[PDB]
Symmetry: C3
Subunit: 512 residues, 3 copies
């Protein structure tokens, strides 16, 4: 009588409504354990047997409820598709830091495991999610977050832990538009795969086989506010064609080669603390902390250091030989500011390629260098415009050195100093000159006049050479004339006597 | 017998306590669905009918429990006041990104909706809160988080979603002391309203009608660590009298005019990526990315770019013409560092007003400029002190140019170089001079001596003019004397012959 | 019949499974209230009596479930050890901002209190955790998170509130490897104690008796992304031997002395807004905002200001007299960039000790200073190498001033300017010289030649003194020769006549 289907509804409660609706109100979503056999449910709650409990999940999904509650039991699923906008609610008590053996997990919280040699555990659809779930696939195959359809899928994981997966991403060649707010990526082959438009708050990347966090082309956009990278058995941060990326705060600890790899993707590192790197590397050309190539990289507060293992360990020597490894065609950009990038052993750069634009300011380990704009800096010494070198015979056509400047406004004037350096290629003698140049603009155009010229033994002078009245001490004649109407670009003309023919390699630098 | 009020307590359990207390322990707070009719509760759980279920909420509040549990059903409330320190616990499965139609919401999680043409849905009090709730008011009226009493109210929303509201704030003229840690502000008329002492962790501002995140006077203080602003149909970030504000990391995407507006509020942007802006604007004077006025603005890592819509779209041309639009009285402050603010089309500034203090360093698109301190920079060229221009007739009273310096200590000396520029206003001729000045202090006071003077044709000289022994080549007499006892401020006196009277516009610049 | 142990299982439900398993599936963990007497449980749910309910917790722990559910009732425990990997799940409705009296807590959420004069409430083990729990110990004794064994313990608290504790840490001398993601530390004696490898997301430190957040030696590592420090009755931030530490974003408000204290620990402050400090201090030498000693401190976006209490208050005058207080042996490092550190009243530094390395750039209130590298800055004026002072009699052994430079490559040349300053110690006269030096390297070695020398009255000259052909105006002979083979280091030799003997204090500065 009371043991039948309608038995529960026949017993009232103190509130005024019977037991059945009292139980119905307490649940937030449909419980998976409801669709389970007694022995199978007991095994799930006891963490003992595999039991391949995929039918419970299939029936829970077929119920049609957008909310699925997975209690702390241990599950084993096989190729069960998750319908759209379906979320899995789970509670965890302990998320293991390092899962070295199958017995790493204890009771802890909810665990969903792949069964036997299944090719997948879940086939995700758009707008799916999960909380408190520790996904685990025993084999390093079966990539996690694998969509049923080979297209971009937007999901989200608030607190979850992915273990022993090939990659947290679909089909090895497609992207997922997700943001792992607080997750733990451990013992995988790829810590994060091809996330697009992702905002990852506090993830943790532990020792992963292979690369770790790897992004490919198109996986444009991505922010990693406070992620931490542990001893990844591989490349750690790896970006190839990601248009954007920014790792904000947390450190990048020991990695087994190229703690950061940047190939064609613009990136920015705000406060990344790039610790030791390249534990397993070939020393020269492969022990650098950052492998920079053909891309734009910006750094604002990056710190670095060298060292060995924390304690014990097979390798104790300071691992990273260099800091930068540059290769490929030289067309990238590099901006550096306020970064204490002195962490290396033998050198700073391991290639003959350099970014087309360099902006390094206030960073120990690298003197200030700027290659663009009117005001540039070379080796810590500033100058204006360009430093042109003109080598050739300074007879019958005075050598021309094209200088640049900020410019002069109308009815305005400017003054500046030029360092002129002469290196006679034949004899080997050296000479120097300091001159002061004033640029003035009237209503029509601008003109340049040499205020003063000074040198050792009065070798250079504004007076014309090849003249009987010329001072015999003077060997070089220097003059200046403006090319552009804005006086921004002019040129210095240097000539010698008609009789002598020699190459001197004139160099003119405009000092502010 | 068992169907009465005391029926539940008469059936024991395996643990040792009967069913009634077993049910009482499982619940964390009082369930709202308990105070509902069968048909009304079924409609709530089925997302079908309006049913105007305000009495359930009123009775739940009148119960006196500080915790209110709202299951995933759909509700419709009307002007129900929430007592103090009362929190609404809800679970959501999917929070819509863009709610374009009434059928945007599906099953998803808990939804609380305004009913018919009610002027409000909730009247909040101090220390209220909510989790997992997607508040929705069909009409764009009825501002959310509207306090019953017209005063400041401190609330908090961990994970909630506000849709189609006039503003998330009370009475259109009062403030709320809240911090939206992880929220979604979509299709409102104002994304965030007058939050005071707020620390917003990871909010999301989607396409909102009107301004979006707008703060007014008094709403002093506010931090937006990782918020993201989508295509707001209006002003996007808008601050008027907020004393403080700092947007830390996330980007500011396309907005329909003045992606940032700053009127009288000091602000700071740490790593904001200000994307395209001013989709709907009047081009000149209204297409700038930031409308800066009469305030203090600081930037540390700001990035910018131009572009059109992602795909399709009515407008495809690069939207923002400029980067800065400055108007109003010029008394503000502007500090810029390490910001790649090259994102514009035609210009950089759209006004004749400039901040009183400018500190721009290492930012592409703007040469270094500093207006305060001893060491200043103009157009990338540094100098010390001030660059004074003195125009007038240099006869019978030598023209005086007041120069500044860091100072000289007791029994100490300093040397520096001065560039002197002369522009004869009548004839139009131009002349220049370089001189070296040494400042020395003895026990009593300091004095200045001119080490050297050099010019073209020896026009200037330290020798006295109007003397028969004077070199005829010399036309100008230059001298230096100290005014302050600290030698920090001195002046350069330039004089001409007694016979000639002309204005030259002398300019003296102290080059380090 | 139905009231016995097996009564619940005899009533079926609509789903197909009886009431007993229906109740068993709804619970996530073992409920503590299950192991309680009727009157004791009623008192717990009514927040009325102490009742010393430790046996319920002991039996719940002895059950063996890794998950413990604490409902919103008020508890009183005494020295109950928490087994490993055990988490306490609680729900809170209101976390008090300031607990001034015992009646500060109302109904609110789950509260666990220490009973009578117990020496502890919980004895934690490895991998323990808690959520939503407001721990409170009435006496300021009984440190929270006190491990049973005196060793490092790794725990974690997502959302918890610690009130009136001696310190959140074990045994006053040991460390805990935890990360308080979102916590509230109020009215304690120490806000945070000896956290190791901690990543604290959004903590809140309210008015705490004593220091507040204090770290000691070994508590190396720690990140405080968005913590906020309120009016701590003590030292606020206090680090002694912590190897690392970085406070990222949130402000540091009024503190009762040394808002930051750094003794031997390297630290970095990214965007800390250090407000007023030292409300209770001895003015001179104790009213500084930061007490810096013998350590490395870096700052990137730090802001500061002065002021009094918000309203009312006993003290209304601007509190912090200075900004820095430096003491102890001078061997530390200091890096400053883009920090508006103008917040003080009387001065900036309160000690005669300075860091060995200083790098201050683009920070108002302090002129640019750099002490390392080839390019240095003093008081906003740049130079290359070192500024040596050589005092002594310049007769029979010319005085030598060792200058440094970046260096010259093979078959390369460089030019630069040297400022030479002479202060005759006997008479008191002062003199200055400007000279231009060219360094050139041939195949073998490098050599230096003086391009030009200029001074007032031609006092200095490259010609040899003590020669009958020497110009009588020349008093000093200057020469330059290179010491290193790289021409990076050379020296300037200055000599006088043989007859005169006097000390001049020569100073040579290499201006870029």
């Amino acid at each position: 009588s009371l043991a039948g289907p309608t038995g529960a509804s026949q017993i009232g409660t103190a509130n005024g409504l019977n037991v059945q609706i009292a139980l119905d109100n307490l649940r937030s979503g449909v419980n998976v354990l409801d669709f389970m056999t007694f022995a199978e449910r007991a095994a799930v709650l006891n963490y003992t047997g595999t039991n391949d409990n995929s039918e419970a999940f299939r029936k829970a999904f077929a119920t049609g409820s957008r909310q699925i509650i997975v209690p702390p039991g241990r599950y084993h699923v096989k190729d069960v598709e998750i319908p759209s906008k379906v979320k899995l609610f789970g509670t965890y008590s302990y998320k293991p830091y390092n899962v070295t053996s199958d017995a790493s997990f204890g009771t802890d919280g909810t665990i969903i495991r792949k069964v036997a040699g299944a090719d997948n555990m879940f086939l995700w659809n758009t707008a799916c999610a999960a909380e408190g779930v520790m996904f685990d696939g025993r084999d390093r195959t079966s990539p996690a977050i694998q969509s049923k359809s080979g297209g971009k899928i937007s999901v989200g994981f608030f607190k979850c832990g992915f273990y022993r997966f090939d990659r947290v991403g679909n089909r090895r060649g497609a992207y997922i538009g997700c943001s792992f707010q607080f997750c733990n990526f451990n013992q995988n082959n790829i810590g994060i795969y091809n996330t697009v438009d992702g905002n990852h708050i506090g993830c943790t990347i532990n020792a992963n086989k292979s690369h770790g966090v790897m992004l490919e082309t198109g996986a444009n956009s991505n922010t990693f506010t406070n992620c931490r990278n542990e001893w990844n058995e591989g490349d750690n941060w790896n970006f190839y064609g990601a248009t954007s990326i920014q790792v904000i705060n947390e450190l990048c600890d020991r990695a087994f080669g190229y703690g950061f790899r940047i190939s064609n993707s613009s990136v920015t590192l705000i406060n990344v603390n790039i610790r030791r790197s390249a534990r397993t590397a070939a020393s020269g050309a492969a022990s650098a902390q950052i492998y920079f190539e053909s891309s734009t990289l910006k750094m604002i507060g990056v710190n670095s250091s060298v060292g060995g293992d924390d304690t014990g360990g097979s390798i104790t020597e300071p691992s990273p030989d260099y800091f930068f490894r540059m290769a490929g065609t030289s067309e990238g950009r590099l901006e550096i500011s306020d970064s204490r990038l002195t962490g290396y052993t033998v050198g700073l750069i391991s290639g003959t390629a350099r970014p087309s634009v360099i902006r390094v300011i206030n960073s120990p380990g690298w003197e200030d260098t700027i290659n663009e704009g009117v005001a540039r800096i070379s080796g810590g010494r500033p100058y204006i415009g360009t430093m042109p070198t003109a080598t050739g015979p300074a007879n019958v056509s005075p050598a021309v050195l094209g200088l640049s400047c900020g410019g002069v406004n109308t009815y305005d004037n400017d003054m500046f100093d030029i360092h002129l350096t002469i290196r006679n290629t034949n004899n080997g003698g050296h000479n120097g000159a300091i001159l002061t140049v004033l640029l003035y603009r009237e209503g029509g155009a601008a003109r340049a006049t040499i205020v003063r010229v000074d040198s050792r033994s009065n070798a250079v002078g504004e007076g014309d050479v090849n003249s009987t009245s010329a001072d015999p001490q003077q060997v070089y004649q220097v003059s200046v004339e403006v090319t552009s109407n804005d006086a921004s670009t002019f040129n210095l003309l240097v000539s010698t006597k008609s009789d002598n023919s020699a190459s001197y390699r004139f160099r003119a630098k405009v000092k502010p």
